[PDB]
């Protein structure tokens, strides 16, 4: 599998992604992920809401398998229903 982070929050609550995500990539070995700034590429956060295919407005947003999950506690969600069931 292959994450990707777009974009920050800062907000503590929404970092739980990030973290998550990275802890997961010392959990699991196989599945790196990737942080990516709209800052560098320049993506707004109606470009990451277009992209991701619904009007998502929270932060940060990570994919997984190049597939928009949403926030943390989505990013939670999705890894249930795919790994951890
Ligand atoms: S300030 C951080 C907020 N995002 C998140 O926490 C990610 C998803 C969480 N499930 C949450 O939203 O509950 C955020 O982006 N807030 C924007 C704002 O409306 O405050």
């Given at each position: 599998?292959?994450?990707?982070?777009?974009?920050?929050?800062?907000?503590?609550?929404?970092?739980?992604?990030?973290?998550?995500?990275?802890?997961?990539?010392?959990?699991?070995?196989?599945?790196?992920?990737?942080?990516?700034?709209?800052?560098?590429?320049?993506?707004?956060?109606?470009?990451?809401?277009?992209?991701?295919?619904?009007?998502?407005?929270?932060?940060?947003?990570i994919?997984?398998?190049?597939?928009?999950?949403?926030?943390?506690?989505?990013?939670?969600?999705?890894?249930?229903?795919?790994?951890?069931?």
């Open positions: 599998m292959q994450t990707v982070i777009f974009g920050r929050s800062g907000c503590p609550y929404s970092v739980r992604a990030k973290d998550l995500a990275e802890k997961l990539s010392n959990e699991r070995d196989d599945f790196q992920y990737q942080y990516v700034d709209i800052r560098a590429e320049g993506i707004t956060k109606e470009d990451l809401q277009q992209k991701a295919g619904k009007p998502v407005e929270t932060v940060p947003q994919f997984v398998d190049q597939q928009h999950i949403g926030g943390y506690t989505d990013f939670a969600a999705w890894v249930k229903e795919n790994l951890d069931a």
